[model samples]
Target: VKPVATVHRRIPDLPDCDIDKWLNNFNVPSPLNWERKIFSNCNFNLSTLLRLVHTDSFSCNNFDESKIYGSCFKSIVLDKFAIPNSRRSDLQLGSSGFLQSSNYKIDTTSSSCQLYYSLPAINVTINNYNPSSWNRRYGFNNFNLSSHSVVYSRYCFSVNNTFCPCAKPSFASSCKSHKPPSASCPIGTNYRSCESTTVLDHTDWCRCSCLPDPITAYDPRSCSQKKSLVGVGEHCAGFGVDEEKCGVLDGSYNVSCLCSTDAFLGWSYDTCVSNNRCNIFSNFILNGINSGTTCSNDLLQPNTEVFTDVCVDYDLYGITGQGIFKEVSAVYYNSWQNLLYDSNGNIIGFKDFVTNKTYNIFPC
Candidate 1:
């Protein structure tokens, strides 16, 4: 009989700075009153955002069953938050990350007005093998040295490929010439005709830009809501997944028409950091002991799994030399602004907003 090696996983503490910085971008005020609760001896700040909107105590169960918006489970607040103007129906925010309802309904119960906001959702991977099991099978006992390789993953999120499901696609695609999505320029603007920006991969495409007339002042909002599409970080929406194939005449494509792209962690809005590799070189060690035939096809195999806690020293912020990854979505709300305010009624930075203590998304 073949013995199965017991495997264990360690998840590192994710940075509160990333979550905090993302939340502050919406420019909301602080809460009028705040509350707190201790669950399993850990301190969790309980507010209207956590209790009313997100519902989950410390973690988000949003993406556990579905791989539509990244594979790993997001933090409690991160999961429940909605992207601005996303095509998805379940998002938490209104149009362009607004906190209000699309029907223009007012919430008399809440004291403050909601605002538009956005943030990048991130995902990473970690993997390792049992050092003790490997050492016992091969005749070497170096548990301390083996531990160093335990934090890496075979499907590293840092790698830009299928293994890193959250990785973004490469730019520099061949541009194709086509008619503008909308026919007329905007309400008050004149069509300047299509102009060539950059020719890539032996293909040249024209971008239709709107110019303002001398009489009317140019309000970025008025130019045709359909034409006001923002880049990775800008607000979006006007339609939902349930909307008709060409219903309501909103003026956007139903297919992959948005500026942002979905990734392994969540919807990629703009620039965000990717998780680092934890367990490295464990694969080579396992393959070395073939023993002439398959060794029971059991013990000492590479282990890859999702971790909710900070298991290693990783740079969650894009401060490291590695370039930024842009596969995430930002969620904005009217209430969190007050929840993040200072004593003087000023909005605080995310670094000062959230506590440094780490929490795991799993264990329940």
Candidate 2:
């Protein structure tokens, strides 16, 4: 019901991290407003959130991600939005302090999913703090540190207004609401699911399939005039000997899914579904119906979520960052590729630290 304003101020910066911490929104802001400061990120180490009290500021040129010793301090926010669309954990801010006053405020910010990470999930407010209380390091009158990943209460927009909940993953939804756009598939090629920029659900693999559209419900029979449409894991094999021509598209009618090679494993398939459901990893029968056994898992429920052994660079739903897991690219988890060095440690190259397998390449 109120106008929201965000102030990403450009305050004078000092090198001291400890003193700089006092100037952050959590500390400097008026006590009456502490309840509104949101402490996001489930990955935040509680220890890093603590701050020591001091009267003056200091320089923090040494406190950075590269600093072998782990250190924390108030770092400058990125000029533009620092948060990404996916789960990411990187040492973005090195060391720093602010020489300016505690003018940073999230007092009354706009309510939206984009920057909602700053919004508070609850309504509990706290009493203001005294600079004198945390002024002494050894004084023991101590102070500091912070909550929620998402707000439970829905952001009520104006009547009929379009909006995406902050609780949802990034890019999972948008303001505009519309049914799936019409698409055309060839005679032999049953409308297969293809990738789209927008991701609607956790298990939703298709954005432009001919069956039921993502946004709205459509006729299940529209998926198939014949047999039941199978999904990623219930059942693909109809009855007779499953023999699908590897290259051609003769029996590709019932299933509808995008093709990705199934090399890893966790892949599953469903058959005779309410819609054109096929496993995102449909390399099993290859393409086309009768090419191979689709599925025989009758116990599988229709709406049950399925898992895939698909190894992707990022989560399709954007809930996490590029670090859902790590990677085995090349040398230099330490920057310098060719030359590996340490004061006491010597040089080294592509050697599997685990099995000590030295391959022609890094061998991911």
Candidate 3:
């Protein structure tokens, strides 16, 4: 099975990810006080309990074949008053941190589902890092890294304040009493389990782990998914797949810890995979401009907690520059092109790398 793990790096805290600003709530100040509304004006008139989140896939119905096979659901509820209409009054005292967002996806299919108790299964918080932590040296890229690869979407969200605790809804009873305008943003991090299923026991609810949201989740998944890198074995071939060819420096296959294209295999989480790969022979090459937002030499050791942002030059996937993963950076990983180097190893390219298989393993 694919393994799943994540690294918790210390990142900056930005307020732009707040719901008020994201939703264009201009009245709120910088340090938003969720306590009370500063404006008595009724400029914002939302009638339903609204919450917005991005989704690549979701079950539209249970056993209804009559409905469209690939039908999807996307909508939000903006309550007219202080508390969401779906909750009770007794518990409606303060903000639920459940309503607010900076971005949104306009769903064409509206007014399709039954009206019932609704809440966001995931929450998207502003990342402390300005651009993102997708570093090239780490073999990471946004969904746009390549063409015809919807699987590479660069969107992520967090699951907080919404989970079934102990096989039961933790906040089911306290659904009400939340004051309106509560910033849906939560501080720190959290975990969420999948919804109940037929064949699975309620215990399948789960503990802390990576949710559907978070771009970093894709990086690990991408590497672990590549079975050939590990070699021929029962699973994706433990790290020892190509050891004989690459030669075991410390004892890792393809220099990637024994990862199985499953999950983010961190060093501590796995017996000997995560840490070794993050440090050894990891090459991050940023071929073009945007130097300030691109590469950094501050690479993190295996057992550390932090994320490095990376960008793929969609057009060219070549190697350039040498820096640690300490800060922001960008590069084109999967471009297939040529390089004309002078006395220095610096790449002098008139164009970016194209995907003709030369840059084979480089993720675009």
Candidate 4:
């Protein structure tokens, strides 16, 4: 008898490869003034790389009379090193990084089966100075570089054989709820499952079919009936136009929802809206252009807070002429009072506008 350890050592041969030829095969453009680095000290051959990564083959059922066979591997730890710290300040070099990607192309004309491989290039970055301290503080020290591949084998019977239904039904359901819409199975039918015309809505009533053995309680529906029946709380068919499809002859036999065109203020949908309410100062209505309304109440009121308006005049007109502009300035208001500012920074009092207000003025 063959030893179990000997049988487990068997792995498939890898595709033809050359580290020297492939190292320079990339199309990635280099950063300006930066030198390119290929497999600087990589010494392993293709066979050794395959062995290190534990490449292997396996098989699975295709679900139809076919069998699928395949192969794969992971994170083959290609290479690692540190870069010399001899670059100008502007070139932000993140101490180190790694590579990942794959390449395999399989062409098969079956809808149920496919096989392929892919590879990607991603370069991460870290600060160069104090690299040890950064790695220790942030827990970024050890990791693996990754790669992957897949292969498929097919076996379809050459001659005719047993014609079988799916090992299990793609769709099945139990029948219990019955009201005005009710149907009964024939006596001794031994029904095991029911299939719907469409998964979305049970528009068509289920037609019963017999099961060879009662493995499950679901009954099978007719494969031919194709009418769409609406249910309670589901959106009716005539969605876009302003007409009700529920509780109508052309729609489902049941009525649960009414057609609605009302939308609340802040939310914007393609054509219809909901009944949710929103606030004026809420970020949801910030731009105003989004919800089909112009924002008018966007200002800070006076009764809630206190303020002192700081004035700055830098134009030469402040020193030469009687000055350019005179503007209203105020803090909080218990009642109402007027205050004015002269070029010499003095205050005068009188009655002005309302108790709580803000304004911006320009003078010539």
Clashes of each: 34, 32, 61, 12
lDDT of 1 by residue, 1-364 (tens): 1112121221223222122333333222111001111112111222322232222112222111111111111122121122212222322323333222221212223221222232222221111122222112212222222211211111111111111000011111222453233222222333222344556653555443222311121442322212222222112222111101111122322222221111111111211111221110000011111111112211233443223332222112111111112211123222332122345643321111122322211112
Which prediction has the highest TM-score against the true structure?
A: 1
* Model 2 C-alpha lDDT per residue in residues 14-89, reported as the tens digit of each score: 2223212322222122211112222111112212322322112112222222221221112222110111112112
Give candidate 2's TM-score.
0.15
The model with the greatest lDDT is 1
- Residue-level lDDT for 39 in candidate 4: 25
Give the per-residue lDDT digits (tens) of candidate 3, residues 1-364.
1111232111112112122322322121111011211221111111111223111112222223223211111112221111122222212122221122111111223321111121121221111111112121122222221111111011222112331111112311222321011111112311122233233434332322122212233333422112121111111111111111111123211232221222222101111112111100000111122111121112322332222233223212223332212221124422233433445644433221221212211222
**RMSD of each predicted structure:** 28.5, 30.0, 29.5, 31.9
| lDDT of model number 2 | 0.20
| lDDT, residue 282, candidate 4 | 4
Q: What would the TM-scores of all predictions be?
A: 0.17, 0.15, 0.13, 0.13
Instruction: Sort the candidates on lDDT, descending order.
Output: 1, 3, 2, 4
Q: Is candidate 1 or candidate 4 better by lDDT?
A: 1
lDDT string, candidate 4, 60-108, tens digits: 1222212111111111111111111221121121222110000011112
